[model samples]
Target chain A: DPMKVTVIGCYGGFPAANEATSGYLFQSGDYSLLVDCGSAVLSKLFGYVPAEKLDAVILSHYHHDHIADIGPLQFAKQVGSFLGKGEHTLPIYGHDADIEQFQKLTYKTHTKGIAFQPDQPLTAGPFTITFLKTIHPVTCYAMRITDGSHTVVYTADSSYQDSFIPFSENADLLISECNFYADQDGTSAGHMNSLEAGRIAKEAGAGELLLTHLPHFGVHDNLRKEAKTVFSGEVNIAKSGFVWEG
Target chain B: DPMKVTVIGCYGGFPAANEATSGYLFQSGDYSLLVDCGSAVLSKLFGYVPAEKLDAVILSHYHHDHIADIGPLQFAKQVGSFLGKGEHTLPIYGHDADIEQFQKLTYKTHTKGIAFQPDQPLTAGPFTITFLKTIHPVTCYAMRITDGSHTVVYTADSSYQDSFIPFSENADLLISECNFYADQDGTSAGHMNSLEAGRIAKEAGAGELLLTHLPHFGVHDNLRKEAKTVFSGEVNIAKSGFVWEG
Candidate 1:
């Protein structure tokens, strides 16, 4: 399948400079899906598609860094309808692990929330998606999406785990969270370092690896270098507006 | 009073292309206060002041367009503390009009919520602030802030009301919400048009009128012209990084 993944915001924890946190635009023609609406994601998303035109928005988790932009995204549709921009109501796909936050995804007549289960394979727009629970402090999930011919696995937020290797086996693109340096231990924090990210891709025989959810401090090039040491395949660092098409 | 107000994000409804929603950095000496923490605000705010360095944060209302970044902001402090960037916990001062939204401001010891009432003048950092209930669909307040020598009034969200004339009387800078043009009536929507904004500023004898919370479709300059029709003082449109100093 011919698909494009645009990095809306890739920074970890908080936004850095003008950068945003944890959002990506996955598209296949007119069928587009937004994965994660973190801080400052709406502004960047608007550069690609106006708010009311989006087909679906599926979140990885309800963490502030992953879901902060949902409100603004919903509000955009609310006002867009008022100004006769679009009348379509946006559907937000999320897990109901946190019922309170899950309920908030629905706002007025603009947006509605649809819960996704781990065992179920959900079809959103043109992509068929499956999930695997991540080892995060909070309830988060990793998503594997396919559009007919190609597949992409997104390791949303997690510590190093052997389960990811088989789950992402032979994927075309593997987007993994690398929030810490190679030397730092992120197991307790439920995050992965650059080395661990490469290990997962290398063992999984993934086609390519893209390191995202970057840290605030440290040399960014060092993370890329560390990942290359373990994974010989083409490795890239996620940046705003960076797109990978296959 | 050596005060500087930096417009972090000035868009209304939702963020524009790379633009943010309502947030401002009000600084005096070494103390800085953030007014409103809307969508994409944390990213823009970091360009001026880091999350842990901010002295305080205040809210006008709990509208999604007005308070979307509170969670991301709290997470910044949480991560900053873990990374040893700063140890200070943030204090978010907000009215308890919506107790659930107000309670959500305090998150895991990184941030605390302090309630402020309209009857009492609250002192946050170096600014002495007073509140006026605005005419909105929800419970909201307009802030009048003074730093010993100069005063600035911010009409957070409101419709056309005569009380605003007295509430903003003789202020150094009057930040008014202009969500529509002169021909449009925003009274029912609980927002103000450019003409109504100018009329309030003209009647209140404000030192200057800065139109903000702008619309997405109109001619940007026309709002300024419409406001200038009634208010003779400096009429300006709010934009990202625009600073007002006195």
Candidate 2:
């Protein structure tokens, strides 16, 4: 299989029944990097790969829905270390503002937090990851990841901004947060409506746009319809276990 | 429904597929109290009752498996407050030692932590709650709760101690942690084996024994069988949405 990106949890806040919140797993060969280890993510991730096989974790923010399951990973790593099952330490990458809280939440010798500047790019496995500061209430970030061949950008959690167009320009896939309906005014709330997501994808000239971090309420089908109006690219609604290859 | 106790998440550490970690919802009439809100608990909770309608939350400890989802609850409460959906603040009752970490984890003005002494009794809805200090690595408490007509005891997480027998004596139901098999030793790890759980229930003369906070490994059927050997009363294994009415 080619490099696969699995949507472990797509909903923004807490999940709906049989759903999960804000987690994704990116796999290229033996290397696996988990983004935003939300609740139920660990359970779902194990279905894809064992905990010991995971290469690293990247956190976009400190919000519970995005970061809570780090506790479980830390605990598991600590126990595994004690039992001598695998390498003890797991690298966790996040912004400076979120590192302290993340350390406090998962405070374990086995879990190490590496602080990164939003403007700086980092290397993990075969991917070179770049970050863009997003317009969210908290210290949030959008990420553009490339394996030298294909690129994918994830708009962590933010209101639509024209600046994001350049951040995600001509990407293979743009995983954008479409948290509200087109008719709703979500600009002030730091979340984008489906139309805003579509506009960003179209302006950026993205090949495909995957709508994620969806709101639990309202008709989700309308979100797809709203996005289709503005973006000519393929628009796919993210659901649990949905995999995208790039 | 009569007075019911529903298992939202009953596993101890990390959750397994289709399983959740450390949470329970107790209800009688319009009163609902969530005990030990953990991973995926909030999502499962909404399946039973709306967030605004929940009466209160009682925490037994500050372990991640027990309190991780409090972050989600706080975020939801803040968003709900912003949307004018319900009360802005949520009442969280926890020990003084755990209150600080709990507040830090949630980090919201809308989620208030109420510190309670182990020696003191508390009233939430119709239930009168009492606490018993348990043998654990951290400050943990076992609870005895009575709603005049019915009673229940919850051993949050601890190594087996004879002292717990009196704390859970003659209860309508005893929701106890049985984190290991009878053949395995959990004393050093600060968890109880199935045999210990059964002994506690038998000594306490509890009406029924509900095994919770189970281990994800090994045959779960063995846990029930081990508990049955010591306790002649009804022994039930807690699963997601497993309900007991009194």
Candidate 3:
């Protein structure tokens, strides 16, 4: 009757313990959705989430920090296709230009077989998913998953935009990227800052605001002080092991 | 009689069809020795060398580009172990620091008792080896292998330091890292340029100077032109599938 969200990676750029880059696993019963496969995401994702259960993977962009793991992900599915992992072809979602770059970087592997397609809404279990383009340097979009009763929106890496307001309107949970310090310019560079996260959460009227994608330079201790400066709603910092029983 | 050296990955750093990082198989009839496993090395090595014949693996350093495939190498040995490939553990030689990092990186897999330490000289059929220290950032060693009479040295990754000069002195086939273009500053921090390679080959009086580990700035053809400008000896631009007859 509820969704389960597990933070697979917390570190923004380099690989750390259970911390690769911006990646999350959303599961509700037998359905699964992986968000943002960064440089070291594929191995870590396999550590926790099985590929067969992963119906679709939504991307925010194709930045190395956010989408570096696409090569290994495709390779893991290919020749090293482990037994009993099931035959699950990843229905990847990304912008056309960003996906092109991804293909170019991984031409040998991508040309062989795996291809990343544009964001298209598809159903999995009880959730209705929709991909909405957002304001980012690279072509990135936010995804909204609704189980007919409750809504959970995930903002991949993006600058604060009023466009996401309508898509995340009245959502129960809004997951967003906070890739910089409070006084720093994260959203201006196509990523969320503290003020942007609060404004988006407030404008969208979300019950919970989850600040994700904190780089090493972006101190976690300052997250509350920063997010609270804009929104009084319950704001939480995303950690690797942090799980939300939706 | 001479020992055969099959250079699996001739180029250094990342993988390409023309060049790959340092991975070589020293095969004297049946015995095989793997010298320095680098990134994207497993595939190329698999094309020529059989994992079962690998008597020992010599780790030069712990750089990701140098020893990225160390995990799979150990795993390959483990599979060979299960299949009754050899009675003794697969001998692995490295300095203390590098071996520690290897165990640290793959700590989980290390405790499985897969790796083997060197006891007597590694001999599959006709290869005997010794590990020598090289001048590199991490704790690394150049490998010296002699099948009773003929000796070949793999100058894994090093500069023209006094120590490395001795390691490559008077070798039959010296596979060294001509990492940077020639005429460039040979004493650039961390690596040896082509001029340094030529000077070292001249100083050490090596039989043949096979330059490997060209940087990414230019093509292998460009790296070759630079190396040729410095080393007047018989220079070979290493490529995949080019076998070194013993």
Candidate 4:
């Protein structure tokens, strides 16, 4: 299956003007999956396909920034089904660390919540995903997804860790969070600096690097340049519709 | 209290491109109140102040468009508190019609939910607010807010009803939903067209009419023109930062 990842939005804490936060559209041919959202993406991703049309979705954490659009997403599916008889079932995969928020994932009739176990590999549509528990204050996971022939590793939202190098080993594409600058330390913030992201990309031998979940402050181009200094590969910053395919 | 209402976003179902949905900022000098949000407004309203700084907030319903930004708003408070000590407690007012969703409004320590009674008037920071139950699938309410001298009636989300005339009687400003055009029949959808919005404004003797909760498909100026046919008052369609001072 030919796979692609499109950056619906990339901002970390909150959306900037006309920009959304923490939404990604991963697809392999006819199968589509939406990973994370912050409500701004509901308007941003309608250009490609409706929310109801997606095969599945995975939430990295229950934090507002990662799961913000879940309310609109469930509502959109209801509106979609009421309009006509269409594909109506949307399974949302999220960790049940917070049972109260996990229950919110199960909307009336359009969507259902399924807890994903980090111990086992999960198969959704045409892709196989494995999870790595992240070093975050909130329970979060970094994901390694493979579409049989190609691999894409997404360091969803996490602090720097040595395990990441092996977790994302030999990735065809690496989508890493660059929430802080090279000079600044994001270790306590449970985020990564550009230098850390580049080292992960370098050590993991990723073919390309796409930095996402960025901080609102700072010149974005400089973040990309810093990542490229250590990694001898194509480096790009996340923006709406910035796509990577293999 | 000197009062003004600024439209953060006005669309109904979801946010439009570079546009948000159903977020209004009501302010009186030092006090601020945010009514309805759909996540898109988090990016839109940062120019005026941060989410943690709002004096108060109200959610008319649990529909995603109305309460979507709540997650981010609560998270912002957590972030604000972590960045040293500031005014961290934000009170959010809404009906407990959907108990499950209402509980979500109460976050860590930043935000706490206070139930509003339809039979009683609720007092926010600088305004006295009364609620009117709306004709919608979900449990929704229309609000009439008065800052001592100036009164603004916000028909949050509802279908046509003569009850609005008395509820919004002699309003200084009428902010009603015009989800459809004059030629369209939105009664079955639990919404109103420009004709219905104008009739209420005309009958209530409102000084100014601001039509919000708009549909994205139509030419918006035409919606305002149609409302003006019946109501001789100054009618304006909702746009980002469209301010009303009384």
Best candidate according to lDDT: 1
Candidate 2: CAPRI quality band: medium
Q: Give the Cα error of residue B67 in candidate 3, in Å.
A: 11
Per residue, candidate 3 scores C-alpha lDDT tens digits across A75-173 of: 444422333345546666555564455453333322132233335565755777787777777677678878887788888777777888898999899
Give model 4's TM-score versus the native structure: 0.87
Root-mean-square deviation of candidate 4? 3.2
lDDT of 4 by residue, B28-108 (tens): 988999988775887788776666568888999988888888887787677667666485689988899789888988987
Interface RMSD of each: 0.9, 1.9, 12.4, 2.2
lDDT of 2 by residue, B59-151 (tens): 999887888788777777766676678764668888887545755533456777887678988999788899999999999999998888889
Tens-digit per-residue lDDT, B101-147, candidate 3? 65533323221222323333544356666666666666666666778
Ranking by TM-score: 1, 2, 4, 3
In terms of docking quality, model 4 is acceptable
The segments of candidate 1 whose C-alpha lies over 4 angstroms from its true place after superposition are none
lDDT over C-alpha atoms for residue A75 of model 3:
41
Tell me the DockQ of each model, to 2 decimals: 0.86, 0.55, 0.03, 0.46
For residue A202, model 4's alpha carbon misses the true position, in angstroms, by: 1.9
Better of 3 and 4 by TM-score: 4
Candidate 4's DockQ: 0.46
For model 3, the superposed segments whose C-alpha errors exceed 4 Å read A16-18, A79-85, A102-120, A124-126, B1-246
- CAPRI-wise, candidate 1 is high
TM-score of each: 0.98, 0.95, 0.50, 0.87
Worst 10-residue lDDT window, candidate 3 chain B: B107-116
